[PDB]
Design a protein around this ligand. Structure first.
Ligand SMILES: Nc1ncnc2c1ncn2[C@@H]1O[C@H](COP(=O)(O)OP(=O)(O)OP(=O)(O)O)[C@@H](O)[C@H]1O
Ligand SMILES: Nc1ncnc2c1ncn2[C@@H]1O[C@H](COP(=O)(O)OP(=O)(O)OP(=O)(O)O)[C@@H](O)[C@H]1O
Ligand SMILES: Nc1ncnc2c1ncn2[C@@H]1O[C@H](COP(=O)(O)OP(=O)(O)OP(=O)(O)O)[C@@H](O)[C@H]1O
Ligand SMILES: Nc1ncnc2c1ncn2[C@@H]1O[C@H](COP(=O)(O)OP(=O)(O)OP(=O)(O)O)[C@@H](O)[C@H]1O
Ligand SMILES: Nc1ncnc2c1ncn2[C@@H]1O[C@H](COP(=O)(O)OP(=O)(O)OP(=O)(O)O)[C@@H](O)[C@H]1O
Ligand SMILES: Nc1ncnc2c1ncn2[C@@H]1O[C@H](COP(=O)(O)OP(=O)(O)OP(=O)(O)O)[C@@H](O)[C@H]1O
Lengths: 484, 484, 484
C-alpha cells in the first residue's frame, strides 16, 4: 500500500500497548527466550485470541510437542483447542519427527513444509500462523550460514503467502545472544525477547520488543506474569498521568485527624503513614478500614506483616470488630508474606483483588515490608504501579511505611516515595521525662490546609486520642526534646 | 482426558508444595545439577516413596553406578532397596558398560534400551521410572544435534508407554547452561535444577522448578538439605500468613517486666530483646526459660554464643539452677557456633529439635550471631522461617539481638527485624555520674498496653531488679543524659 | 573550514556536528550495530536527504530486505521512495537471494556486484551509495581472511568510481568487537558505531564516530532517538557556552519574592527551587506559570509528579485558575512519569514541545523526579541539556528539586546541580513551638543583590504569604532552632 504498516491485535493483555497496535501484518515476528519463558504460550494465545476475537482462522506448526499435548496443556488456561480444531478455526500441523527418525531433511521439508503450511493456510483460510521452535528443525547438524538461508527462505515464502506469523526460538543465556545461532535476529523483521531473569533466588519474567521494521513500539523490558489467563503484561511505563481529581473528602476513622487534615482525606488521594515500629501505623490503617464499612463501603486491607488472626485480635483490642466487617462483605483482608512472590505478582494480585471486590478504600500495611530484598528501582516501579492504579480507579488508598530508625529519622521514607504521595501522616516517638510518648503530624496535604502542629497522642482500648502539641519544647523532631 | 494436568506426589518433603502437586503424570521431568547436588537421591527417593506410599512399582535405569552401589548407598537413608527388589516392587535396570567392550554402538542401544525398559515396565507394572545420568550415555562422541534426537526419541517412547519419568542430567556450571548439551532443556516437558552454590566457602543447596508445561508451580530457587531422611526442602515463600493468635498471657520470668508488658507476654507472640553487649539479654533469656520449667513446661534454649558449661555457671550465679531444669526433662539446651553450618541447616536443626521435644517456649540467644557473614536477605529469610514456625506452632518465642553499637544506636535492629516481631524489649546503657547504669524498656506490644517508662535496672545474684525511670533526665535514649 | 578532507552533509540532525561536516567524500563509512540499532534507517536517510536537499541521485544496495519492504518501511518516516525511484533520483539494487537458491556465490558476485553497482551509479549519475548488510553476503561460509579481501575490493572500487558510500554491518555484543569478523574496522576509512544499550531494563541508543581517516570529529558516544522524523542526535558536548544575557527582569508571580530577588527574576536565567516535600515548590511553579499568562505570554509546565487533574484541583485551591490559562492558549501543561522513557526521550520531548509552542517561560516540576534510577552523570547531562537549551533560547526557566531529607539537609541538591543554576530559592521546615512552619530564602542570585533574610511564610487559599525572619533564633537551618 501507500501508507505505513498495519498491525494485527494479539489481544494479549498489555502487548498491543507495548507494540503500538500489535504485530505487523503480513510479516513474521521472532519470539525467543530461554526454556520455560513462555514462547509457546505466546504463540498459542496469539492464535486463540485471533480466533475468539476476530474469527481469524489459525495454523499452528509444531516441531517437538505433540498435537495432543498442545491441546492438553492449553487446558491449563481454560483454552479448548480440540473444539476449535473441529470447528475448523484452528489447524495444528504436526511437523514433529517420529520415534523412528531418518537422516538429511533440510530441503525436502522446507518446501514441503511450506506446501503443507500453504495448503493448510488456504484450506482453512488461515490469517494467523505460529511456528513453535523453528530452532529444533535445523538443530540436526547445521552452521550459522545454513541457518540464515533456511530462515530467510521460510520468512520469505510466508511473506509471499501474506501470513502474519509468530516464530519461536530458544536461547541459552538470559542476556547473551538473542537466539541460538546469532543469525535469526537479523533475518526477522520483528523480534521479541521473553526473559526469565533469576537474580537473588527469585525469577522475573520480562518481555521486550527489540525491533519492528517500519513502525514504533515501546522500548525496554516489561514485566509480565503467566496466570490461569495466560500472559499478562504491565506496561508500567505506559500508564498516563491523567488521573481524575476531586475536592470530595472522606474520613480517616479518627475525627481529630480529619480536623488536622482540614476536613478529612480527599477521596482522590494517596495517603502515607510513616513512623518507627510501635508508633501505630497499623492502628490508623484499621481505623481507616472500619470507617469505610461504617459508611457501608467496601475496603481491602493488604497485610504483609501480621497474620489474619492477629490483625483481628489487635483490632478487637482497639475496639472495632473486624469479624462483622467481613460477614457484612464490606471488608476483605488478604495477608501474605512479601517473600511469597515477586513484586510483579503482588502487583497483579492486588489488582485482581480490587476488580473482584470493587473497593472504595484500600490500605497496604507496610510498603516497607514489600521493599525487603528487592532493588529500589524495582520497588519504586511497584509503588508507582499500585499508586497510579488506585488514583485512576477513584480508590482512596492508605499506605504504611516503617522507617528503619526510631527517633532521629532525617528522611520520611528510606525508599524515597513521599514524592509520589498526596498526603503524608508522620508518627514519631518523643522521649519525655524518661518516657516513650507518641506524636502525630500531618506533614503535608496537597489540596487542603491541614494542621501544622506536632500533637502527642496516646493509644488505649478505645483507640487513638490526639491531644496537644509540645509548645514548650525544642528539637522534638529528633525524638529527644529539650524542655524549656 | 479433557482436563488440566494431573500430578503424582513425590512425597519428598517440600517438593509437592513447590510443584503444586508433584510431577506431571505420564511425562518426563529433567533434573540436572552439578556433581554431588543430589540428582540420584531425588530420582531414587522418587521411586522409593512411590513404592512405600502408593505401592506403585518402579524401574530405575542406571548407566554408571552399579546396582549393588545404588542399594548400598540408599542404606545411608535407611532405604532397603534390596528388599523391594525381591518383593518385585523395584527393578534396577543395569545399563552400565563393562571394563571391556567395542565401539560404533550409537543409537543402537538407544533403541534396544527403549525396549529393555518397556519390558521391565510391563513386567513389574511400573508407574514410575527414573533414568540416572542419561547424559553419560551419549557421552561417547556426540554433538548437540545428535543428543536432541536421542532424547526426544526416549522421552517420546516413555510418554507413549505412559510412564511418569525423572531424568538425571549433569551440568558443569552452577549458573551456566541448564544441561551439558544445552539441548535437553527444550526437549523435556519439565525442568528441575539442583544447585550447590558455593559463595564464601559455604555451600548452599537450592532446587528450582524452571518449567512445567501445562501447569503452575512456585518460581525461583528454594533451599533444601540432604539428611539421613533424604532431600528436605523449605518453601519459605509458601508459608501462609494464617497463624493462630490468642489473648492468653505468660510470664517473662521477671514479675516487674510482666507488669510493664501489661500482664506479661502473650502465649502466641514473638519477643525481641535488643541491646549492646552486657546489657543483659542473656539474663532475660535464662529467666524466661526457667519460668517455663517452674510451670512444668518444656522449653529449648538455642545458644549461639556461650558454651553449655558457661551458661550453667552464669545462670547459677544469677540463682536459677539449670542443672535441675535438665534432669526434670523440662529444659533443653542446644549450643553450636553459627559457623558450624548454613542458615538452612540451622533452621532445620531448630525445627527437628522442636519436634522431638514439644517445646512450649523457645529462646534463641543472639539472632545477631546467626547473622554473621550471611547476607541480610538470606538472614531475613531465616528469621521469617524460625519466626513463623514458632507462631503457627503456638510456641512463645524470645529472640536476642546485640546491636553493633553501645549507646547512640538509632535503630532497634541493624538487620531490620523489628517489623517481624510482636514484642520489643530494649536494654540500654546510661552514663550517669561517671558510671554505666542500665535501663529496660518495653518498646512495643501489639496486643497489650505496656509501660512507656525507661526504667533503670541493676543485676545481682538474685537476678534483674527493675527500678524507676530517670524522670529528671534528658536525652536518655542517646545514652549520655543531661539532668534538668 | 580548516579540515583537510572535503565532507558531504548527511542532513541527519546532529550527525554533521559530530562528524565535523559530514561524511568524507569519495570514501566509505562503516556503520555497524546490533539488531535494531538504526543502521538501515541511517543509510536510507543518508540517500534520502541527499536527493531532497542536494538533488544528488542515490543507489541503495540491499542484500536481505526486499525493495518493496524498504519502500514500505520508509513510509514510517513519511518518505516516499517509490516517488523518487520513478523520478529516477533513487535506485534500489536488489541483491538479496531468492527463496529457492543453491550454494556458493559470494565471490564472483563480489565482481558481478561491483560491475552491477558501477552500472547503476553511471546510469543514474549517483553520488551517494549505501550498501545494507554486506555482512550477510559472505555470511555464506567464510573466514576473517576471505572477508577482508572482499571488503577491501568493494571499498577500493567504490573509491575509484568516486562514490561516497555508507556500508552497514552487524555486531552481536554492544561493547565487544566492532563488527562480526573483527576485520571490517580496519578496512573502512571511517567507522560509525550505533549502540542500543540495555542497562536497567531501559534502552539507550547512542551513536559514536570511532574514526575518520584525515579529519577530526567528536569523540565518544552520543545519545540519539529514532522518531517519525528519523534519527535525531544530541551533541550535548557540542553545545557552546555563548548564551545571551540581559538585565531584563520578570516577575515570579509572588510580589514579595520579587522584592527579595532585588526586583524579580532575570529573563535570561535559570531558577532553582529546593526544599523537602510539602515546602511549596509546586506552589511557586504554579504562580510562576500563572504570571506569564497574566501578561499574555506562553509558558509550559512539565509536570512529572502530579496528574493533569490534580495540578488543576490544587492550583484552583490556591486561587489561580489553570482552566482559563489553557483555553486562552497561554499555558500548556504536559505531565508524564519519568519511568515512561529515558532521559534522552524526555529531553527531546521537552525541546519539541518548546518549538511547537514558542514559550517565554518554562517550569519543570521536580528534576529530582527525573533523577530516579538514572545515573548522576546521565542526569547532569540531561540538566545541562534542558538548562542550556532554555538559556540560548531566551526562555526563563524555573526548575524544582525535592531534597531527600526534610530539615538538616546539608547540601542544596543531592544531585549537585546548584552550580549550574543562576538563582536558587530555598524552602524549608522550621520546628517552632511544637509546630512545622515554613521558611523561604533567596540563597543566591548571580546578577542581583537579593535579600539575605530567611523569611517564614504561610500558605493559604490566596497563596504564599512571605512574612518576617526569625531574628531571635539560632540554628534555623538545622530545622529545630533554639529561642535565644
Ligand atoms: N496456569 C498456569 N499458571 C501459571 N503458570 C503457568 C500456567 N501454565 C503454564 N505455566 C508456566 O508457563 C510456562 C510454560 O512455557 P511455554 O510452554 O509456554 O513455553 P516456553 O517455556 O517458552 O518454551 P518451551 O516449549 O521450551 O517450554 C511454564 O514454565 C510454567 O511454569
Ligand atoms: N490495647 C492497647 N492499649 C494501649 N496500647 C496498645 C494496645 N495495643 C497496641 N498498643 C500500642 O500500639 C503499638 C503497636 O501499634 P501498631 O499495631 O499500630 O503498628 P505500627 O507501630 O505502625 O507497626 P508495627 O507492626 O511495627 O507495630 C504498640 O507499640 C503499643 O504500645
Ligand atoms: N546420610 C546422608 N546425610 C547427609 N548427606 C548425605 C547422606 N548421604 C549422602 N549425602 C550427600 O548427598 C550427596 C549424594 O549425591 P547423589 O549420589 O544423590 O547424586 P548427585 O550428586 O546428584 O549425582 P552423582 O551421581 O554425580 O553423585 C553427596 O554429595 C553427599 O555428601
Ligand atoms: N553475679 C553477677 N552479679 C552482678 N552482675 C552480673 C553477674 N553476672 C553477670 N552480671 C552482669 O550482666 C552482664 C552480662 O549479661 P548477659 O549474660 O545477660 O548478656 P548480654 O549482655 O545480653 O549479652 P552478651 O553475651 O553480649 O554479654 C555483665 O556485663 C554484668 O554486668
Ligand atoms: N516512526 C518510527 N518512530 C520511532 N521508531 C521507529 C520508527 N520506525 C522504525 N523505528 C524503529 O527503528 C528501528 C529500525 O531499525 P532499522 O530497520 O533502521 O535497522 P537496524 O535495526 O539497524 O538493522 P536491521 O536491518 O537488522 O533491522 C526499529 O528498531 C524500530 O523500533
Ligand atoms: N489551600 C491551601 N491552604 C493552605 N495550605 C495549602 C493549601 N494547598 C496546599 N497547601 C500546603 O502546601 C503543601 C504542598 O505544597 P506544594 O504543592 O507546593 O509542593 P512541594 O511541597 O514543593 O512538593 P510536593 O508536595 O509535590 O512534594 C501542603 O503540605 C500544604 O500544607
Amino acid at each position: 500500500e501507500h501508507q505505513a504498516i498495519a498491525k494485527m491485535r494479539t489481544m494479549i493483555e498489555g502487548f498491543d500497548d507495548i507494540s503500538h497496535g500489535g504485530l505487523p501484518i503480513g510479516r513474521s515476528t521472532l519470539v525467543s527466550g530461554t526454556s520455560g519463558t513462555g514462547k509457546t504460550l505466546f504463540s498459542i494465545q496469539f492464535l486463540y485470541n485471533g480466533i475468539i476475537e476476530f474469527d481469524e482462522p489459525g495454523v499452528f506448526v509444531t516441531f517437538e510437542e505433540t498435537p495432543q499435548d498442545i491441546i492438553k496443556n492449553a487446558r491449563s488456561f481454560g483454552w479448548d483447542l480440540a473444539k476449535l480444531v473441529d470447528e475448523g478455526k484452528l489447524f495444528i500441523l504436526d511437523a514433529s519427527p517420529d520415534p523412528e527418525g531418518q537422516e538429511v531433511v533440510g530441503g525436502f521439508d522446507l518446501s514441503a513444509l511450506i506446501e503443507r503450511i500453504n495448503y493448510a493456510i488456504q484450506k482453512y483460510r488461515a490469517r494467523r500462523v505460529s511456528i513453535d521452535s523453528v530452532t529444533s528443525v535445523f538443530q540436526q547438524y547445521d552452521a550459522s550460514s545454513v541457518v540464515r538461508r533456511e530462515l530467510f527462505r521460510l520468512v520469505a515464502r510466508l511473506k509471499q503467502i501474506g501470513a502474519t506469523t509468530v516464530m519461536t526460538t530458544e536461547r541459552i543465556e538470559e542476556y547473551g545472544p538473542i537466539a541460538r545461532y546469532g543469525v535469526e535476529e537479523f533475518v526477522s523483521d520483528n523480534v521479541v525477547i521473553l526473559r526469565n531473569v533469576l537474580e537473588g533466588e527469585r525469577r522475573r519474567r520480562t518481555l521486550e520488543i527489540l525491533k519492528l521494521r517500519g513502525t514504533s513500539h515501546m522500548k525496554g523490558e516489561y514485566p509480565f506474569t503467566i496466570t490461569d489467563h495466560g500472559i499478562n503484561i504491565f506496561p508500567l511505563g505506559a500508564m498516563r498521568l491523567t488521573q481524575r481529581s476531586s475536592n470530595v473528602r472522606v474520613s480517616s476513622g479518627v475525627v481529630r485527624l480529619d480536623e488536622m487534615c482540614g476536613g478529612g482525606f480527599f477521596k482522590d488521594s494517596i495517603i502515607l503513614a510513616t513512623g518507627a515500629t510501635g508508633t501505630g501505623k497499623t492502628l490508623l490503617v484499621s481505623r481507616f478500614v472500619e470507617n469505610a464499612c461504617a459508611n457501608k463501603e467496601r475496603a481491602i486491607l493488604f497485610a504483609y506483616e501480621e497474620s489474619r488472626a492477629q490483625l483481628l485480635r489487635n483490632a478487637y483490642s482497639w475496639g472495632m470488630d473486624f469479624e462483622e466487617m467481613e460477614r457484612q462483605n464490606l471488608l476483605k483482608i488478604v495477608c501474605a508474606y512479601p517473600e511469597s512472590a515477586g513484586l510483579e505478582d503482588h502487583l497483579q494480585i492486588i489488582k485482581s483483588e480490587i476488580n473482584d471486590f470493587k473497593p472504595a478504600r484500600i490500605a497496604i500495611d507496610s510498603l516497607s515490608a514489600l521493599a525487603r530484598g528487592v532493588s529500589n528501582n524495582a520497588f519504586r516501579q511497584f509503588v508507582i504501579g499500585v499508586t497510579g492504579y488506585a488514583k485512576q480507579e477513584e480508590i482512596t488508598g492508605l499506605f504504611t511505611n516503617t522507617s528503619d530508625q526510631f527517633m532521629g529519622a532525617h528522611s520520611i521514607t528510606d525508599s524515597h516515595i513521599s514524592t509520589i504521595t498526596d498526603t503524608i501522616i508522620l508518627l514519631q516517638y518523643v522521649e519525655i521525662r524518661g518516657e516513650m510518648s507518641r506524636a502525630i503530624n500531618v506533614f503535608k496535604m496537597r489540596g487542603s490546609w491541614h494542621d501544622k502542629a506536632i500533637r502527642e497522642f496516646m493509644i488505649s482500648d478505645k483507640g487513638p486520642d490526639i491531644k496537644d502539641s509540645f509548645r514548650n519544647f525544642e528539637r522534638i523532631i529528633s525524638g529527644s526534646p529539650t524542655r524549656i
